[PDB]
C-alpha cells in the first residue's frame, strides 16, 4: 500500500494559498526518495529531518499541504518568515518538522491576458497562527467607519487575484508548493518508509 503522493504532486488543479489544501497521508508505505532524487523541483528544503534518511523513518501522520504562490514568495514557506503569504495566508511554526517542495508552474498556471483563479489574502488585521486557514471574505475595515459589507474607501475586499501572465518575470511567476509535515506522537505509526 503506497502512499498517494501522486495524487498530491501531480494533481491537475491546485488550491489558492488562502484556502490551502491538506490531505492526511496515513496507513501506507512512503517512498520519499522518488521525490528527492528528482530534478523536477527548484525548492526541496527539509527541517528537523534529513532528506536522505526519509525512507528509514516512521511517523504517526504526514500532512501534505499544497497551493500556488509567486516565485519570490516561496521563500516565505519556511520557519521564521514574514510577508503577505507567511503572515496572512500560510504560516509554518518555528518547530517545523517536514519538507517544503516547490516547482515553477508557469506553463500550467498562467494564461495570456492573465489567469485570475489563484487568490491570496492581501488585507488582514493580525498574523495567522501556524497551520491556520482563513477563508473569510468579509470586507476589510481600514478605518473607523464600518463597511457593512460594501466596498469603498477604507473598505476593501480582502482577497486579490495573482493574475498570472506568462510574460511575468520569474519572481512573479506561479510556483506550485507541497509542504510535507511529519508528526511523531505517543501513538501507533501509520506512515513508514519501504
Amino acid at each position: 500500500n503506497l502512499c498517494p503522493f501522486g495524487e498530491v504532486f501531480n494533481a491537475t488543479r491546485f488550491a489558492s494559498v488562502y484556502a490551502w489544501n491538506r490531505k492526511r497521508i496515513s496507513n501506507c508505505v512512503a517512498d520519499y526518495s522518488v521525490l528527492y532524487n528528482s530534478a523536477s523541483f527548484s525548492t526541496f528544503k527539509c527541517y528537523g529531518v534529513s532528506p536522505t534518511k526519509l525512507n528509514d523513518l516512521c511517523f504517526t501522520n504526514v500532512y501534505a499541504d499544497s497551493f500556488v504562490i509567486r516565485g519570490d514568495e516561496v521563500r516565505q514557506i519556511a520557519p521564521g518568515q514574514t510577508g503577505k503569504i507567511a503572515d496572512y495566508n500560510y504560516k509554518l511554526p518555528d518547530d517545523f518538522t517536514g519538507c517544503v517542495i516547490a516547482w515553477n508552474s508557469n506553463n500550467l498556471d498562467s494564461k495570456v491576458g492573465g489567469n485570475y483563479n489563484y487568490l491570496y489574502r492581501l488585507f488582514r488585521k493580525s498574523n495567522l497562527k501556524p497551520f491556520e486557514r482563513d477563508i473569510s471574505t468579509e470586507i476589510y475595515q481600514a478605518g473607523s467607519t464600518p463597511c457593512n459589507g460594501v466596498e469603498g474607501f477604507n473598505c476593501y475586499f480582502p482577497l486579490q487575484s495573482y493574475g498570472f501572465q506568462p510574460t511575468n518575470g520569474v519572481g512573479y511567476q506561479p510556483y506550485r508548493v507541497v509542504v510535507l509535515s511529519f508528526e511523531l506522537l505517543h501513538a501507533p505509526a501509520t506512515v513508514c518508509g519501504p
Partner: antibody
Amino acid sequence: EVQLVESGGGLVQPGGSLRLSCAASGFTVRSNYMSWVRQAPGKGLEWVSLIYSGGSTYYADSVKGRFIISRDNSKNTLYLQMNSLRAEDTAVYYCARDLAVYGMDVWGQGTTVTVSS
Amino acid sequence: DIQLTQSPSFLSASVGDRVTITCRASQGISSYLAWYQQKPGKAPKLLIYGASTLQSGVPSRFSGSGSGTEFKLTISSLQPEDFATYYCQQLNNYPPVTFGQGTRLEIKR
C-alpha cells in the same frame, strides 16, 4: 479629514539620530500598510520602509539596520527612528498609507532632514 | 531586481495636446503598476493603480495602459495644471528601484 501630517525633521550631524512622526486622520494606522518614502534634493522617490498591520517591518538595503519603523496605536501615529545618519540620508521624507495593489493614496506634506558635518 | 526606467526624462508640450509618457519594467510585472503626479515642493498624488484603473477624484483626461513591461500614461487634452513630474511605481514589490526616475512635463515654446 483624511490627511497625514509629518514632523521631526531638522539638521543633524553624521552619526546622529532623528525620530520622524506621522500623525494620521481618516484611517487607522494599526489596520493599514504604511510606508516611508524619501526624495533627496533634486532626485526621485526612494522607498525606505514599510510596516504591516500584523507587525512585520521591511527596509530598503540603503537603510537596513539603521532605521526602525514603528507606530502608536492610541495616538494613530506612525514613526521612523533614524540612527547612524549619513550625508546621503539628506532628503524630504514622506509617510504614506500603502494600499498595495491600489497604490499609495494618502501622502503627508513631507518633513525635511539634513545630515551634514 | 526588477527595475523601472522612465523615458523621456523631460518632455515639452502645450495646452490641449495629447501627451503620452512611457515606463518600462526590466521584467514582466503584469498590471502591478501605479502612476503618480508631483509638483515642485508638494507630495506625490496617486493617479492610476493596477496599470489602468483611475484613482477616485482624478480627472478622466488621465488614462493608463499596458501590461507586462511597457506601460503608458496618457493625457487626452493637456491642462495648465498638468505640467508636473510624473513617476512610475511597481506594485507588490519593493526593490531598490520601486519608483521610476520620473518624467517632467514642461511648457513648449
